[PDB]
Amino acid sequence: PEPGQTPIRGIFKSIAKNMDISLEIPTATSVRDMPARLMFENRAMVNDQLKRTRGGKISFTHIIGYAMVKAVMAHPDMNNSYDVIDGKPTLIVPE
Amino acid sequence: GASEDRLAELGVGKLVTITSTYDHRVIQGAVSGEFLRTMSRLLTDDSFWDEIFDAMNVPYTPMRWAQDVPNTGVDKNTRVMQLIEAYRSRGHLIADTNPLSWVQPGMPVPDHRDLDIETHNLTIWDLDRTFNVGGFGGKETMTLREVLSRLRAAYTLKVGSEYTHILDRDERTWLQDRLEAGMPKPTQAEQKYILQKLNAAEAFENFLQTKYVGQKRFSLEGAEALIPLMDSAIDTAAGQGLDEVVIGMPHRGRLNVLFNIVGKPLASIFNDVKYHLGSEGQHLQMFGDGEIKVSLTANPSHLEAVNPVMEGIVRAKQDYLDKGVDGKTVVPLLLHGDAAFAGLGIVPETINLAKLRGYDVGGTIHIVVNNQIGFTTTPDSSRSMHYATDYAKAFGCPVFHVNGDDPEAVVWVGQLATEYRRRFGKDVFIDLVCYRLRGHNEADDPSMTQPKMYELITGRETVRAQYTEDLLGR
Amino acid sequence: PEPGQTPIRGIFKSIAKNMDISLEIPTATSVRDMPARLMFENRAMVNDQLKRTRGGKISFTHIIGYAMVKAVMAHPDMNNSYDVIDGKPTLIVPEHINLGLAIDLPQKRALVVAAIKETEKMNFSEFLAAYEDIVARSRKGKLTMDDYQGVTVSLTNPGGIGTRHSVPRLTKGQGTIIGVGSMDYPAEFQGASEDRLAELGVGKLVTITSTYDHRVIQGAVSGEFLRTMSRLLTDDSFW
Ligand SMILES: Cc1ncc(C[n+]2csc(CCOP(=O)(O)OP(=O)(O)O)c2C)c(N)n1
Ligand SMILES: [Mg+2]
């Protein structure tokens, strides 16, 4: 009964530590499938302009990432967090 | 494991699944659901894609979300044909021809909804469906995506063409087939040759503005692609085995033309009288064994008065050579300004002589340096025509509108226009869409009368600098 | 480094407290997509009868809610819960099926769970009346403390806003929470015409989830429960 044992060190120790602390956050997940056809088409038009101009390519994560920022501004509750301030449960509203 | 055509017949679209994992102590499920709904709506929203395209400088309208149209009696193949005609006739109305992101207030805008696939009851869902195209591109069937790529390459990039008003079927089909064959991919050697001509054009402009006084009136800054445009036409004429090119032009860029086109030495130019005298020179081609004489005609400050005189000079030289109907080996290259071309009546009065028995010279190559201004007057007060070069449609002649900040497209247009003149013996019109960097004279702030236009002009890269950075980027 | 700080108070403090306590329940989730076409058709026939008679409209949550009660009676393990009685792990078998409805209340928004009690002795008309009584009193602030207690099983509908499915949290005292997802077509069919879809035979679906306490409910039982719900939604006797 002798498997390999190697201590977790460095950045991997920090990831593992944060995953242990994450156990105190009661989470739920929402799942939604979205039509992506128009994204494929319009991303291709932007990249075709760039290949003919000064190069560069935009990704799907750039578009979704920007849509995510517009959505957080339309629904600000998504940018808030929980913490125990002054021994009480409190809502943290970032700047 | 399915084929793309079978999926296109059903209308199966691509998806993305997005999740939201949240702290339930401060965020509720309904809020998380609303957040994901807004993300889905944004990815298919008109305003969202307008904002992205504006930021990335895509001078085209994005594709719009729509539902796949229900199967009623309506046939789509005959409507694909109507879309092909619309692009051939009016595709120049949405072509990337203006180096400025400028729309002149005061000028009326024609409706061109016929260029949108939604007007012909077609959507993004038809892009990968096959249609009957009636011999378009030499094919019987094609996908709507292939139809749009061919139509976009031919009619909506840096060259906007006007040719469907031509009555003769053979001449109209020659232009159609060459424009739909596309603009060839330029070689590295070709790209370096264009960069050398642009270096020469800008080096001369900087010498004139800094070593001499009172030359802001005569600046070519903003229209430096005129040098490789004129060189392209004269070089193409030398390859055709022709004998001479006679130039008629106003003051703007005259000393630049004398040094880089006519070939006069710097000592001979520098010793406003020079801006009205005539000159003679020679043009040899770097990639060939052809030679051609180049002449410049004398003219007064009265704009466009040189037009009839210059035509007569050409006819006299052609009559002395006497080579018959298949001759016409003295090419008239006539330069204009956009305000003067549209406004002065001598311009169409002289073009009316082009096919007449005693006045025919085999066609004239017209270049309009369209800098979208005339002293302090904008096109909304200069003409009742959509484009400055619209007298061409009266004489049944083709027009090529080209972006002055794309020197590859400018040299291509110069070659095609000179090829058209040798084959059909008619006038050809090149509208070089550029801008004027300085004011009309030395003591003139152009922002006094046109502040909004000069927000886009002041502090932008030159055509040379922009082209170098563009080549390095791709 | 100064963000807004505001203490959580009232009903929101109670929700946050219960979410902290929920961390002690080891849960698993089962996901199943069910044909919803017959539900669309037969719900339309009931609502057409009502618009021509004395008004009223039934919802998809009324039908799914009643199917859920029939399914809990066919699989009773889904109504049980875990607790530490006498210092030992024990199985709690309730006397009734008290269906907790997650109603989203307006602020002066907060999600609260009110219970429809003794659902195992009701037919559809009695179930519909009891359901509407709870939603009516919640809209006029006339719920008592007894309405929030005794919940044995819960039902939430994230599908109303268009969420496909969710992995929700389970509150202490219950054994399972059922979630009802979006009854739209999948995203790949959301731009298609109705005649092209009718030629293939594409039907509407509903995704239903079951998040359960694994200490007292096993995965096979949770899967069987969702199978019975799918069978009921397309069953002759049920309609
Ligand atoms: C027949 C005639 N009328 C008026 C003038 C006065 N004038 C000199 S330049 C100019 C404007 C020229 O505009 P445009 O043709 O666009 O040329 P640009 O200076 O923009 O190249 C005018 C009106 C002139 N030189 N000749
Ligand atoms: Mg001008």
Residue numbers in the entry:
A (entry chain A): 100 to 194
B (entry chain A): 293 to 563, 579 to 781
C (entry chain A): 100 to 207, 211 to 341
What's the paper's own text on this?
Contrary to most organisms in which three enzymes compose the 2-oxoglutarate dehydrogenase complex (ODH), actinobacteria rely on a two-in-one protein (OdhA) in which both the oxidative decarboxylation and succinyl transferase steps are carried out by the same polypeptide. Schematic illustration of the reaction steps involved in the oxidative decarboxylation of 2-oxoglutarate with generation of succinyl-CoA and NADH/H+ (ODH reaction), with emphasis on the catalytic steps catalyzed by OdhA. These include the ThDP-dependent decarboxylation of the 2-oxoglutarate substrate followed the reductive acylation of the lipoyl group provided by E2p (both catalyzed by the OdhA E1o domain), and the transfer of the succinyl moiety to the CoASH acceptor (catalyzed by the OdhA E2o domain).
The single protomer shows the presence of an N-terminal acyltransferase (E2o) domain, spanning from the construct N-terminus to residue Asn349, connected by a 17-residue linker to the C-terminal, ThDP-dependent oxoglutarate dehydrogenase domain (E1o). In addition, a ThDP-Mg2+ cofactor is bound at the E1o domain dimeric interface, in an equivalent pose and active site environment as in the M. smegmatis E1o (MsKGDΔ360) high-resolution crystal structures. On the other hand, the E2o N-terminal domain shows the known, compact triangular trimeric conformation of the chloramphenicol acetyltransferase (CAT) family, characterized by an N-terminal β-strand that protrudes to make a strand exchange (mixed β-sheet) with the neighboring monomer. Furthermore, despite the overall conservation of the CAT fold, a notable difference between the OdhA succinyltransferase domain and other E2o domains resides in the β-harpin that normally lies close to the three-fold axis and is located on the inside surface of the cubic assembly, here replaced by a short α-helix (connected by flexible linkers) spanning residues 296-302.
